[PDB]
From Swiss-Prot, chain A:
Family indicated by similarity: Belongs to the complex I NDUFB8 subunit family.
Compartment annotation: Mitochondrion inner membrane
Keywords: Electron transport, Membrane, Mitochondrion, Mitochondrion inner membrane, Respiratory chain, Transit peptide, Transmembrane, Transmembrane helix, Transport
Protein's membrane topology: Single-pass membrane protein
Listed GO CC annotations: mitochondrial inner membrane
Main location: mitochondrion
Function, as annotated: Accessory subunit of the mitochondrial membrane respiratory chain NADH dehydrogenase (Complex I), that is believed not to be involved in catalysis. Complex I functions in the transfer of electrons from NADH to the respiratory chain. The immediate electron acceptor for the enzyme is believed to be ubiquinone.
Membrane-spanning segments: 27-47
Subunit and partners: Complex I is composed of at least 49 different subunits.
Organism: Arabidopsis thaliana
Protein name: NADH dehydrogenase [ubiquinone] 1 beta subcomplex subunit 8, mitochondrial
Residues of the full protein shown: 37 to 125 of 125
UniProtKB/Swiss-Prot annotation, chain B:
Entire-sequence positions represented here: 8 to 87 of 103
Role: Accessory subunit of the mitochondrial membrane respiratory chain NADH dehydrogenase (Complex I), that is believed not to be involved in catalysis. Complex I functions in the transfer of electrons from NADH to the respiratory chain. The immediate electron acceptor for the enzyme is believed to be ubiquinone.
Domain-related comment: Contains two C-X9-C motifs that are predicted to form a helix-coil-helix structure, permitting the formation of intramolecular disulfide bonds.
GO cellular component, one term: mitochondrial inner membrane
Protein name, entry field: NADH dehydrogenase [ubiquinone] 1 beta subcomplex subunit 7
Cx9C motif 1 (motif): residue ranges: 23-33
Organism of this sequence: Arabidopsis thaliana (Mouse-ear cress)
Lineage: Eukaryota, Viridiplantae, Streptophyta, Embryophyta, Tracheophyta
UniProtKB/Swiss-Prot annotation, chain C:
UniProt function note: Accessory subunit of the mitochondrial membrane respiratory chain NADH dehydrogenase (Complex I), that is believed not to be involved in catalysis. Complex I functions in the transfer of electrons from NADH to the respiratory chain. The immediate electron acceptor for the enzyme is believed to be ubiquinone.
Protein name: NADH dehydrogenase [ubiquinone] 1 beta subcomplex subunit 2
Its membrane topology: Peripheral membrane protein
Gene Ontology, cellular component aspect: mitochondrial inner membrane; respiratory chain complex I
Principal location: mitochondrion
Subcellular location: Mitochondrion inner membrane
Family: Belongs to the complex I NDUFB2 subunit family.
Native species: Arabidopsis thaliana (Mouse-ear cress)
Curated annotation (Swiss-Prot), chain E:
Assembly mode: Complex I is composed of at least 49 different subunits.
Chief subcellular location: mitochondrion
Record has Electron transport as a keyword: yes
Organism of origin: Arabidopsis thaliana
Annotated GO biological process: photorespiration
Subcellular location: Mitochondrion inner membrane
Family under the similarity heading: Belongs to the complex I NDUFB10 subunit family.
Keywords of the record: Electron transport, Membrane, Mitochondrion, Mitochondrion inner membrane, Respiratory chain, Transport
Disordered: annotated span: 1-24
Described function: Accessory subunit of the mitochondrial membrane respiratory chain NADH dehydrogenase (Complex I), that is believed not to be involved in catalysis. Complex I functions in the transfer of electrons from NADH to the respiratory chain. The immediate electron acceptor for the enzyme is believed to be ubiquinone.
GO CC terms: cytosol; mitochondrial inner membrane; mitochondrial membrane; mitochondrion; respiratory chain complex I
Lipid bilayer topology: Peripheral membrane protein
Identification of the protein by name: NADH dehydrogenase [ubiquinone] 1 beta subcomplex subunit 10-B
Residues of the full protein shown: 2 to 91 of 106
Amino acid sequence: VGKHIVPDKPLSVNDELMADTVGKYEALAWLSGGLGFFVGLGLLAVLNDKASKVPFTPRVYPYDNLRVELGGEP
Amino acid sequence: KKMIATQEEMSAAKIALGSRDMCAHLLIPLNKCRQAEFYLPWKCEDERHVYEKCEYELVMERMLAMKKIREEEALAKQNK
Amino acid sequence: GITYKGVTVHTPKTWHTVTGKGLCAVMWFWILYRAKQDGPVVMGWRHPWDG
Amino acid sequence: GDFRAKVWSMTGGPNCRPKHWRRNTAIAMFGVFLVCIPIAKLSAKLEQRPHMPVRPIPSQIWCKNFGTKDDYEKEH
Amino acid sequence: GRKKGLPEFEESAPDGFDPENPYKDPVAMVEMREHIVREKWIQIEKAKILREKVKWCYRVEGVNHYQKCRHLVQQYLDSTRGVGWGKDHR
Amino acid sequence: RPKGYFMNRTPPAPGQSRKWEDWELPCYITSFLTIVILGVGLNAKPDLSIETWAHQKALERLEMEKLAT
Amino acid sequence: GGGMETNKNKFIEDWGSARENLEHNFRWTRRNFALIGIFGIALPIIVYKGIVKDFHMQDEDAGRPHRKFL
Amino acid sequence: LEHFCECYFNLSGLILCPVLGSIILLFIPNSRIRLIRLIGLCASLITFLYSLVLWIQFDSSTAKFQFVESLRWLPYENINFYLGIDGISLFFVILTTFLIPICILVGWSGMRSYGKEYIIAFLICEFLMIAVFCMLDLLLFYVFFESVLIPMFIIIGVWGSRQRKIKAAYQFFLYTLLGSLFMLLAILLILFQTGTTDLQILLTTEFSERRQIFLWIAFFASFAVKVPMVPVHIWLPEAHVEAPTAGSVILAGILLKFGTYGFLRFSIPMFPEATLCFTPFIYTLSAIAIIYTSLTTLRQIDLKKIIAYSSVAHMNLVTIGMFSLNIQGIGGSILLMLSHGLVSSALFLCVGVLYDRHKTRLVRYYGGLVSTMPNFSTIFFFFTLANMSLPGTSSFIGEFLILVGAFQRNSLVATLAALGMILGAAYSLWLYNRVVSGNLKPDFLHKFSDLNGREVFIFIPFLVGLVWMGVYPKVFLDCMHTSVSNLVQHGKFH
């Protein structure tokens, strides 16, 4: 805006392309811990087995559980 | 509770495949007014309440059915 | 506007105060009314088909 | 700003205040309504309603394609 | 100059083609390739017409499409297997 | 008046007209011919595409095999 | 002050000309052996075998012997 | 056997038109600039109109070569040659005839210093290129293609911008000559079997599997230098960048198509068994090139180097579709060919507009051009979108139809090819924003001019072309499907 800076020093090769308080691999370590929270909860859902604790039977629909209405051979 | 609404009647009322249960008969007059009364919540309260009473009893029956099954797993377990 | 050691805060316009008060008031009246009719139902005490 | 006053753009540029913008705006409104005419006739000729509505609708006046696709074994 | 109307082609496969030896009659080998292309295009348009029936069956019948369009779906799916130049050879 | 000039050409003297550059007339004439040769020619040429022929052939073969058995 | 042509910058132009003459600086270092080995030979081969195996799996899925290639 | 066509509009007159223009210009004094310019422009325009009429009388039901006409070489009549087009080559002739007048119009302002030599070279290029697209013989294809090297060499070396044009022209001529010589070896190999090089005949002659493989490899070497394919693609950057704007337009819009057209006209149909055995090999090279050269495009700092590097990625998607050997693959490959010949040329035209005023190609010098060149910025953005295969543009039609064709043959190559969508969008938008968006840099550039009347007219047929094929590609697909269908069915009988 005010004044673009004219180079006075040789430009680097990766100059066309050129997160401050935390390092690179440390950030990955923290993020894997957060993704480890999601994995841990998924395993608890496996061990909870809410499928083995359903308080009602599966629905049973009339006319052969809607065989013809669901596209089954008349 | 026995099927009252036949396949043709449910097909004629274009009933969603998930709602062809045992209270399909009470749904047809409920949906008929819903289209007629612009799906307004403060209308068809009578037709809605009979249908909701149905779908509640069907769930309770299937809840009672599972209670008996739950009460039979323990019979096997204590007789191990 | 009312000045207090340099800072001045202008009084809001009348219909902005009225509309803000009224619309929230309709909301409170809406909630108290719907709690009157559905509070028992959602609290589980009764059923819509009871009667 | 300063040089932007010598720059021609279709959108008008920064701070565009044409002197006759009202008569221009209405001429635009008449044009768009005119273009909306052939679009409506093409739409009404191209609309297809397989099911008769439960109640009469605005489109039962300008559109004549109601309940015509019943024999879908003949579609080609 | 060309006469007004649709193009006309011989309906039957060129006699002179030998399936065991196709590089024996040069003229027939070419007219046979053209015939096969035209035959395949008829099958493609055959399925495309069957696709239109399924489309409007689904649109007309609504939630009753599974029981009502069952036959049209079967016909259309059978036609698309071994059609054109897609994932089926012959 | 608008800001700037369309295509950055200063207007001619008042009462006069812009002088057309040498390329304008041959390019404008060709553009008109291009529209007329394609806009009318493409719509007037017969529909000899293979798809159009096979669609008619598919309708009759479906007719002959449905009317017959 | 005058002329539409850009006011060249010696460092930008040296930057620009360095890029155009990169083949003059190529030395067979360990880094280049690895990069050319991994990305000039190994990766093309892995991709080719994945593509061929994709055909072969289609062959056995359709009850047909594996297609010879190359 | 004389095969003279009954049609009034035939291939011979279209061939002769630019030849007559060139012969007329050699004798006109260079002092008569106005006359030279108008003669060249009118000749090119007449040729374009003739090609449109050739489109009008086209039959989209036949698989037989159309407007077929013969030219005798000897009174012994042993060696007789034929001209003809089909659904595969018609649109390439029309594109050549459309692009040549654009090239004459681009250098209109500098024609005082160019001269008749500039218009003559482009007219001779046009005549040779149309001839190449219209041949039914392997031998004449070789002669006329090998002949295009001389005028392109002259165009690059004389009207190129910097002294790098020397190296660029050298590399162009030598790479193309190597490929052409390999094709010549294949043409003599075929001749020894057949006794002839006539396309209609060799389409009816069976080749042994071993000879099919060997002939395919010699045809491959020729066509793959012109595609271009990795690793013989490195001549294209220097050549396309160092050339003048019209030279770049011809190089990328027409000359690049000769290799993929040679795959469709000769290699694929003539050797159907060899084509199948080499499909995984073609898929690997094409997929590597799309991924590698797109990532290279990201890191280029030159306006023209970015656009030129983009063409390598697009042409290798074209090879993927044409080797899928189905209707969507081949039809998509042809449509992308024509669309690329429009989008790439227009993008080269956009950069040429900027280089004509400012005489720099470095991206870092530009920036903030939206506030000084809004009309150029709007046109630059549209063709930037067309280079990303945006739906609505012509290049999306070819791109998706190829991905459909590749998916039904190999899912893996379709997935690797579809990565062009992510990478192609990355560099295209990065280029547009670094040039047009942002703030001006008055230390580098402080004097600007938007597009003039001639530059605006140049872009209009390009804008109409991409939108037209983008939203209604049926006019093109209708005239191609019969020839495309017979290309796919060639070699099998079930």
